Design a protein around this ligand. Structure first.
Ligand SMILES: Nc1ncnc2c1ncn2[C@@H]1O[C@H](COP(=O)(O)OP(=O)(O)OP(=O)(O)O)[C@@H](O)[C@H]1O
Ligand SMILES: O=c1ccn([C@@H]2O[C@H](COP(=O)(O)OP(=O)(O)OP(=O)(O)O)[C@@H](O)[C@H]2O)c(=O)[nH]1
Ligand SMILES: O=c1ccn([C@@H]2O[C@H](COP(=O)(O)OP(=O)(O)OP(=O)(O)O)[C@@H](O)[C@H]2O)c(=O)[nH]1
Ligand SMILES: O=c1ccn([C@@H]2O[C@H](COP(=O)(O)OP(=O)(O)OP(=O)(O)O)[C@@H](O)[C@H]2O)c(=O)[nH]1
Ligand SMILES: [Mg+2]
Ligand SMILES: [Mg+2]
Ligand SMILES: [Mg+2]
Ligand SMILES: [Mg+2]
Lengths: 559, 372, 186
């Protein structure tokens, strides 16, 4: 096993997840199998309790693991599948040793943070980095560790001490450290003393970095590079200039231009890992596919506008997987994506009493949209706004996708406005009020990867067509409610066909409305299964419907 | 779009490590600090919210005192340092607010002023604007007293030389584009003789054209070298620091070992006609700071004075030439001292106030106000 | 936003009054003529649509021959003046299209040229640019053969004199600003 640790810096939120993902993608272009571990110094066992207002969206795994947003970045860049064990947290590892003590597995010794907890960390990283993450049952060749937080924080102290020991418990040339750092630019001068103080913290903590990755608002001056290469004991070829770029799909081709594969191949002896010529064709076949999609990103010009209708649309990280999944669809259509961020509560008429500026900008955006996404939000407070957005799309012929809550607000709309039961509602919003036309009912989270099976009278639908007309759809779930089965044949009598269901038939999972160009809803989250070179089919269908050429896309899918 | 606190937290750890506690944190930022960012700094450092001062990037540093006055920093330091228990008179307490109201006046007159004046600063290394910091501040103080917005046009003197048009035509034309645009010219008192043949053009241009001029240190010397080559007509006459062992006969510079610090300069008697004696309040002596090794040659003085280039002021011994004015030109003044170092925010240095006034018009209205 | 035909109609009445009929109407306008405006001119004047030429405002007059060539005006005049019945050799008919292709060359080289050259023209009354019309055309022909875009900087020589800085400082500095900017002087 080789290890690359991506670490620390002057600030949090600097770019370690981007460089970790680019490094893994780049190493994969030598044919190497790459895995990843996120370490988060936070104490939470997993992200499933904590709200999207900190660290962005909760990411959902095939396991049903509700995990760190960084694991989603590795899944999409590398083409890999991760377990809940691939996210280390302070909570998991302190919990592991405490549960092991009360059972007596330390045989009556005193259990100390060094060695015992720092040995639990190294036992975990070795257990987990050998887990299969590809379509093939090979153990990986490289693990990337993203060390969360900043080096020199108390919460990081056990993890840097475990990595200090891991650098020796595993051999040298099986371990490298990349340190990401900030170069401020002040009055036209690029300042080196923040990055120098960060190299002192690594030395203090007993680690040496093999690369410095410098994050800056400019290209680094070669005099600034020389200075960093004087204070840190590294050559000029070991400071990579990682400036601010408009697109993160370009960052792998920045580091390829900067010899970082060529360095790591001589620092980690990567040419001495056994690989076939088949593995070495697959590597450059991924590289040329990356150069294709990045060329097609730069010379594309024709725009498509998608309204994302939700709450808290100012924290754009609360929709990170949705956003990436709209981008992958856009890149496969070769049209420039603009997301129009629409707060659903501002669509409600009462906003015109509260602040007229917010009311009109929301409807200005929703009218401007070539397609609409209701993204699969959290907490029912915006539903009466999203019901307008679903009504607008159905009354007007505008392309629509409804994810999770986007099944539900669309079925609630269709019930109130096409069946004509005007109070019919989400039981999560009203519960004890006991209305008779319950659209949502509870059937205790239904979590992780499940099979969805198409109902037989459904090959007419665009959504079965986009999935290659394969009999089953396997996708990730994070829901507690269903559509009520008693209202299904009522809705189907009116053309709102539940095109796909759970194998038991009690649970409604995909619809398409008859006759509309594209009015699709999924109870799963199709975001989490999106890959950079293979967009998620419901999002590719929305961006194609919004662009025209939905038929030419369905034709290409059918080969 | 997020203001990051971990660099300032790591700096408070270094102070604690070294055994110091800060009473204020002054935070420098590209934005106003968010109050949540202030609260966070006030959690990690053991200080109240009233002890983090928000010192954002502002276009003018004359505003920074009025930022910290708005942020209670006097009011804090008065209770942290017991400053009300220092003995002072009511005379001392009138002088304090008389300086404050003079600061609020010059900062108001900085914000509502609109009419521009352009000064060419002709020198080397004009890309390192800190190499002229006192010159720059002294042009600003003159501008603020005239109530006109200063633009310094930064002119590299070597780029004014015709050979630059063989080397790079873009640099040649931008230099002469700036020098033609200038309402006044400063030759600032540089270092190392390599640009002199360019500055000789800038001094020629100002004399041939009537454009206001100030020559400081080297700016006496390149102007006298210009006047010798072009108005007396000895076309090779030169700075001995540039040629030394070459031994030409018309030496304009000669050595008379740095002449350093504050010295007296005394006006020659036939000189009350001059704008430069008028700007100094017609006081008999000028006391100013020196940093020079050469002089103008006294053998060439009565030659130059016969042609109208009067050495209006000298050292008490008379061997050493320190101020000139050329007869008839609106403002063509040179000083061998550096008038920059004696400039104050509320009292600009007289040779620079005279240049910015000459460049603006109202030189007469300024001389009138000086004469009270 | 409406193109008005009654001034051109009143001009056709003066020609009829004076006993002349026009074979072409050349219409000068700030826009391309609308085809409804052309139809209207071709109703009031007794001429076909193919006999109103649309001669809109263009930035360059070297383009005006290629406008009228696009508008069939040779092809009309060749049938209106029986120009195919004038005796000419094949030598004369090579020389004609050799001048045409030389015109299309210099007009192509006018449109795809980009690099500028600035010439100061130093004189009096430089506000009446027609007082230098042959000078101006001669700088243009030189510019077109060098394949660089001409800018004439018009410099009033009296404004270069120092006394102008006593009279009006704006005029003094704009003149020396232009003369310093110049890549050449005339
Ligand atoms: N080279 C880069 N150029 C421009 N933006 C970048 C670059 N690298 C990262 N970013 C952006 O910086 C933001 C945060 O980066 P990232 O998520 O990698 O942070 P981090 O330091 O790993 O920690 P956290 O998980 O707390 O955000 C993201 O919006 C990301 O797109
Ligand atoms: O105000 C100052 C600044 C600097 N110095 C002295 O000059 C040195 C200049 O060092 P700085 O700390 O100014 O910069 P640096 O070379 O460390 O690199 P950057 O932060 O610009 O990337 C300092 O280390 C100190 O010895 C002062 O004496 N006073
Ligand atoms: O990538 C990350 C970032 C942060 N964290 C965890 O969340 C915490 C968030 O802290 P950050 O270090 O992200 O910010 P901060 O609150 O210290 O303040 P600023 O630098 O933004 O001013 C960190 O201290 C760490 O415990 C991670 O686990 N991973
Ligand atoms: O104010 C008006 C304008 C026009 N008219 C009547 O309508 C007719 C419209 O004719 P105008 O004179 O308005 O236009 P036109 O068709 O001659 O062509 P252009 O000048 O626009 O190119 C006129 O000839 C007159 O009979 C009025 O009665 N009142
Ligand atoms: Mg934070
Ligand atoms: Mg991360
Ligand atoms: Mg420095
Ligand atoms: Mg009409």
């Amino acid at each position: 096993m080789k290890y690359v640790v991506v670490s620390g810096g002057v600030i949090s939120g600097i770019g370690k997840g981007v460089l970790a993902s680019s490094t893994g993608m780049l190493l994969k272009t030598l044919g190497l199998k790459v895995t990843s571990i996120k370490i988060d110094p936070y104490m939470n066992i997993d992200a499933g309790t904590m709200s999207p207002l900190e660290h962005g969206e909760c990411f959902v795994l095939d396991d049903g693991g509700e995990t760190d947003l960084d694991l989603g970045n590795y899944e999409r860049y590398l083409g890999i599948t991760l377990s809940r064990d691939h996210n280390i947290t302070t909570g998991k590892i302190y919990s592991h040793v405490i549960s092991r003590e009360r059972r007596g597995d330390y045989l009556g010794k005193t259990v100390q943070i060094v060695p015992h907890l720092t040995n639990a960390i190294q036992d975990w990283i070795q257990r987990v980095s050998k887990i299969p993450v590809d379509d093939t049952g090979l153990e990986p060749d490289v693990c990337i560790i993203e060390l969360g937080g900043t080096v020199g924080d108390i919460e990081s102290a056990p993890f840097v001490e475990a990595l200090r020991q891991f650098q020796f418990e595993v051999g040298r040339e099986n371990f490298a450290l990349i340190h990401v750092s900030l170069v401020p630019v002040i009055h036209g001068e690029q300042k080196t003393k923040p990055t120098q103080a960060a190299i002192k913290d690594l030395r203090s903590l007993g680690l040496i970095p093999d690369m410095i990755a410098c994050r800056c608002s400019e290209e680094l001056n070669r005099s600034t590079i020389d200075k960093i290469a004087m204070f840190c004991h590294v050559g000029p070829e070991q400071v990579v200039n990682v400036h601010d770029v408009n697109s993160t799909y370009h960052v792998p081709l920045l580091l390829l231009k900067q010899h970082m594969i060529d360095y790591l191949h001589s620092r980690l002896k990567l040419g001495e890992v056994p690989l076939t010529l088949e593995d070495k064709e697959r590597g450059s076949q991924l590289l040329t596919n990356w150069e294709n999609m990045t060329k097609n990103l730069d010379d594309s010009d024709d725009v498509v506008k998608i309204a994302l209708v939700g709450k808290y649309t100012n924290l754009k990280d609360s929709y990170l997987s949705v956003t990436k999944s709209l981008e992958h669809a856009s890149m496969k259509c070769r049209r420039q994506l603009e997301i129009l961020w629409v707060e659903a509560s501002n669509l409600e008429p009462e906003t015109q009493e509260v602040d007229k500026n917010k009311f009109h900008d929301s409807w200005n955006k929703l009218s401007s949209a070539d397609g609409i996404l209701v993204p699969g939000g959290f907490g029912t407070r915006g539903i009466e706004g999203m019901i307008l957005a679903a009504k607008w799309a159905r009354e007007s012929g505008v392309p629509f996708l409804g994810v999770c809550l986007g099944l539900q607000v669309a079925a609630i709309e269709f019930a109130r406005n096409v069946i004509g039961r005007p109070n019919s509602s989400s039981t999560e919003f009203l519960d004890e009020t006991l209305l008779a036309p319950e659209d949502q009912v509870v059937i205790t989270m239904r979590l992780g990867l499940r099979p969805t099976i198409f109902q037989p009278n459904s090959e007419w639908s665009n959504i079965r067509k986009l999935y290659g007309e394969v009999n089953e759809v396997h996708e990730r779930h994070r829901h507690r409610y269903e559509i009520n089965p008693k209202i299904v044949n009522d809705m189907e009598s009116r053309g709102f066909i539940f095109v796909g269901k759970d194998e038991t038939g009690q649970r409604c999972e995909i619809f398409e409305l008859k006759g509309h160009p594209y009015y699709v809803g999924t109870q799963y989250h199709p975001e989490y299964t999106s890959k950079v070179l293979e967009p998620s089919r419901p999002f590719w269908g929305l961006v194609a419907a919004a662009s025209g050429t939905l038929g030419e896309v369905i034709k290409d899918i059918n080969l």
